């Protein structure tokens, strides 16, 4: 007994046990359960880091401290564990000595101990090494007698597909329920807890440190639950910091908001952090930023830079996406760019932009490559095309593009991501769309706003396209849309700035090597008269520069004159160019 | 006085130290991960290194010399104990008492000193310390393998709580050069022992090129203690010794299982003129024109220019399919890799199901079979070293035609779950299967610089103008004649012949008589594919009817002779 199971009474009474805050339900409703007449066996069913194993640890503090009814008074919790028990069990019922050794020094007890079995679900199936069960079959009368006063804590999935498996063991336990406390309900738990940590790191800790722990902590991380992570930030924060008063008022050792959300961008990867950076500088010219990489388009910048500060300033619904746009309007005009820049602006990198072409949807059948096949179907366990991704990154800007060429049953799943912000996947998993952008371009319109942009100026293409020929008579899908958007085509006023940034960003690494070019103003309208396009767009501009400017170069080698380290030129005639040294 | 004391003042007075140099943002993560409460259990995971040396020799040097005040210095830690645990104790339970004897009393002085215990991974790992992790006693740094890992350490749910995943990242050739840089305080004043510049990277450059199934620094310190061995013991081998210290010292050491010298392993400035007739101009003498991505693309590639989101060694390669491109993608990997590893074909030929999706780049999910897929989702995997085929992919219907723009231009790298692919070190050769299956006829007055301009110039732009406006460099391989092939019809016959001097038949062919083959020889359809049942039908199943016949006795040479209908080679 005293070789496997740790006392967790006479842990609280050297004050080695954490200070539980709360859980003053859930431990009264495990005293309930713990005081029956028989199957006094509480199983405090949650999930991973929701503080049931600090319930009993609140109860093993609160016997010692009198808090518990007579009854429960002067009891030991004893924490067996079954991974101490399976330790060297090498031979024939070496196991069920250890067992039947605990058990009949549990009966010496004479019911003056709690057994702690923390993760039962490691109980279903201990022994089990010749035939039938060993070790949840073997308390199994003294589980039903009401003699082992058995605090089960297990996780609720772990409960379901281990004991609730074995029937005649689910009904000796109890589920109590530990349900994950709430932001406002675990700052009680961490400012009382703030000092059992200050008193480790010897590091200050502020409860704006601590409001702030729990409100990042439950927004960003959404795969573990709340006291675990809360509590998990203030500890690396306080290592963080330890760092910086040991080696090499300004020297801090104050933990604040400043460094929670440092180490949890260190975790996640979401840049929230202080409002001291060019955030200031970056939060009213949202708009002009986007601008930086979309040339024009001010109907669009409006429309998406205006819903992202919506959010910002946390006056968004929190149980729809950030923004749902339809961006219907011709093709290679800024809609598939500006999801790249609104990716590269809130998220800051335009590779968190889940691209999603609606072509290959073109069939009824192939709507659970979106969403997942069912339980039974190839491809249930892969998942679906969208609702994995956004597990993958429930930050992202989704494109839809050009939704006009999916099935109208598509529309269908994309209804409750706009309207709710969940797609529930094919393994009946909900993914969340609260934190996603869902653009959709489309070209269901582009004929008639081509042709009237410098007719109707700013606001008539959005009235009436919409109910001879566009999208009304299914209803349902408009009004879910947060802002419909449609694009002026470019002129030559935009193509000129919109051909600059062709190799802008390879342009700060590529300077020692003999290159360095400054604008030419002659070749401007070699580029657009390809290029700037009313009909097709402005696409033709990236192979008018793979059909334009990079051929006379890599394939010009073997005649033995042209040798790279002189910049090229372009001009008016007709030369087919040369290149002098 | 003997097991549970080690003094740590000790480490300056013997010079027990071996000093970690590289991993700092690494180790002072292992000191983030200790200084907590949760969580305080740094397992360290991966290659060699650190392993609880890099904390503890990194611990003392801040502390005697003097910087900072003694106001803020006192953390005075100390370091495993583990050798007397098993040795010396005899029965069963009375070995155990030395296991709790070593932990409960250090908690003497109330928690004034604590301590580190280091390699926890064998179970001592959760049997007999497990009480004394989960008691709050003292933290640990663990040291494990990855897979060693989840072999023991995280499919539990006790220690995690605990513990947590430290990788560390594959370290540089710098390893083992700050080694030998200290080291010179043991070697120099008492044996006068030199290693130069090019011997300490000698041992360190087997990671890259030479061999990549086996990590760099264990490969690093063995390799020179074996070839700085060289002086004291080949003097007791029952002008006199190169004191200049070559490349020689680690080839006698590394190469003792090989086979190959130095003279192809560190490719050089100047080795270039050497690295061009080794292996591939004396099985063949030709094949000359792939040569040219080792001669003029080459220059951007290997002396720390290559830039992988632009194709810059990607020179493009055309010609037939089964006419000498799979020996090549086998005789370069055969002239880089010193065997044959090389197995990559893909064709577009002959399937028509829905499968294509996966064999691009990848398979987004909808789908069955993601373990194979496609070739090219496999072979990176398997190992990064392919050389990637591109084949009649001009049939199908024109709806699966412009999905081969994507993969070459720099818009995303295109990965499958977050792992890198190879954009650097292959060459692609495609295969053009339109009108030059007419061509391969004659050999005489075929076309270089008249073939790809006036011929593709009319026949390219009336269905699809979007594949041979970025594909233009056109050469054809070998024309499928006589001689060429009886080349090739003796490459096959002369590992027919070592199949045959195994039994004691020396068999000789003439230029007359491998030619009685070229009737019913080459295909222009299939290539050389039935040039080997040729071998079969016309001589090898009647050679096998008169070895077994007796007719044929091992030791007399035959000849043959011009005969009836059927021509087979009798007396
Ligand atoms: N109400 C609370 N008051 C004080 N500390 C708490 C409270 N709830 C949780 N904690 C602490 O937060 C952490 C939560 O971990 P646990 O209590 O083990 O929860 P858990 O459900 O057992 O998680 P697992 O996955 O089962 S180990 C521990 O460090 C607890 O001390
Ligand atoms: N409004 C705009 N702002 C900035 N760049 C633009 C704009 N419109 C077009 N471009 C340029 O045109 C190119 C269009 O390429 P592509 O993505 O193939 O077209 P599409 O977006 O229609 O698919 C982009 O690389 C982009 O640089
Ligand atoms: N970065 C480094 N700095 C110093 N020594 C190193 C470094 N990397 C490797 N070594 C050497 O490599 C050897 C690795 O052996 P070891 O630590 O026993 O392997 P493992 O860590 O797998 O137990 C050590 O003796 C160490 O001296
Ligand atoms: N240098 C060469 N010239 C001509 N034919 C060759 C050469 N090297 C190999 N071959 C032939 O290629 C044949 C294999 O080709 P095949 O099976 O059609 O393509 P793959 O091997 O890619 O499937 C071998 O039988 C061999 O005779």
Not at 114 to 133: C, N, P, R, S, W
Not at 545 to 567: D, H
Request: with cysteine; charged share 30%; glycine share 8%.
């Amino acid at each position: 007994l005293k070789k496997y199971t740790i006392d967790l009474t006479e842990r609280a009474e050297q004050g080695k046990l954490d200070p539980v805050i709360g859980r003053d339900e859930e431990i009264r409703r495990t005293i309930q359960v713990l005081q029956r007449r028989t199957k006094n066996n509480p199983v405090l069913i949650g999930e991973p880091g929701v503080g049931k194993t600090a319930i009993v640890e609140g109860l093993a503090q609160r016997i010692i401290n009198g808090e518990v009814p007579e009854g429960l008074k002067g009891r030991r919790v004893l924490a067996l564990d079954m991974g101490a028990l399976v330790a060297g069990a090498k031979y024939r019922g070496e196991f069920e000595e250890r067992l039947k050794g605990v058990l009949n020094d549990l009966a010496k007890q004479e019911g003056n101990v709690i057994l702690f079995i923390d993760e039962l679900h490691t109980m279903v199936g201990a022994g089990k090494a010749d035939g039938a069960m060993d070790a949840g079959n073997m308390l199994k009368p003294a589980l039903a007698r009401g003699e082992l006063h058995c605090v089960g804590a297990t996780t609720l999935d772990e409960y379901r597909q281990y004991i609730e498996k074995d029937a005649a063991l689910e009904r000796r336990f109890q589920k109590v329920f530990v349900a994950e406390p709430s932001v406002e309900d675990t700052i009680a738990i961490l400012r009382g807890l703030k000092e059992r940590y200050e008193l480790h790191h010897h590091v200050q800790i502020t409860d704006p440190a601590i409001v702030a722990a729990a409100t990042l902590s439950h927004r960003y991380i959404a795969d573990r639950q709340l006291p675990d992570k809360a509590i998990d930030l203030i500890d690396e924060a306080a290592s963080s910091i330890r760092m910086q008063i040991d080696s090499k008022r300004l020297l801090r050792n104050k933990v604040t908001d400043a460094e929670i959300a440092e180490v949890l961008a260190r975790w996640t990867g979401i840049p929230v952090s202080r409002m001291m950076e060019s955030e200031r500088e970056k939060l009213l010219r949202m708009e002009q930023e986007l601008h930086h990489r979309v040339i024009g388009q001010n109907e669009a910048v409006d429309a998406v830079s205006n819903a992202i500060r919506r959010s910002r300033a946390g006056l968004a619904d929190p149980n729809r996406p950030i923004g749902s746009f339809l961006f219907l309007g011709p093709t290679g005009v800024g809609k598939t760019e500006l999801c790249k820049a609104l990716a590269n602006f809130m998220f800051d990198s335009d590779e968190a932009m889940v691209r999603i072409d609606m072509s290959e949807f073109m069939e009824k059948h192939s709507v659970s490559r979106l969403v997942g096949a069912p339980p039974g179907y190839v491809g249930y366990e892969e998942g679906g095309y969208l609702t994995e991704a956004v597990r993958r990154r429930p930050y992202s800007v989704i494109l839809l593009d050009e939704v006009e060429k999916a099935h109208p049953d598509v529309f269908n799943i994309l209804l409750q991501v706009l309207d709710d912000g969940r797609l529930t996947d094919g393994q009946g998993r909900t993914v969340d769309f609260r934190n996603t952008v869902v653009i959709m371009t489309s070209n269901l319109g582009s004929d008639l706003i081509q042709e009237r942009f410098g007719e109707l100026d700013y606001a008539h293409m959005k009235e009436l396209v919409l109910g001879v020929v566009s999208h009304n008579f299914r209803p349902e899908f408009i009004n879910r849309i947060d802002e419909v958007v449609v694009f002026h085509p470019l002129g030559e006023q935009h193509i000129a700035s919109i051909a600059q940034i062709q190799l802008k960003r390879l342009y700060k690494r590529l300077e020692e090597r003999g290159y360095e070019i400054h604008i030419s103003d002659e070749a401007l309208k070699l580029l657009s008269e390809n290029g700037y396009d009313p009909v097709y767009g402005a696409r033709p501009l990236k192979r008018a520069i793979q059909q334009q400017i990079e051929n006379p170069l890599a394939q010009q080698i073997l005649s033995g004159e042209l040798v790279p380290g002189k910049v090229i030129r372009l001009e008016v005639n007709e030369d087919r160019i040369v290149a002098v040294q």
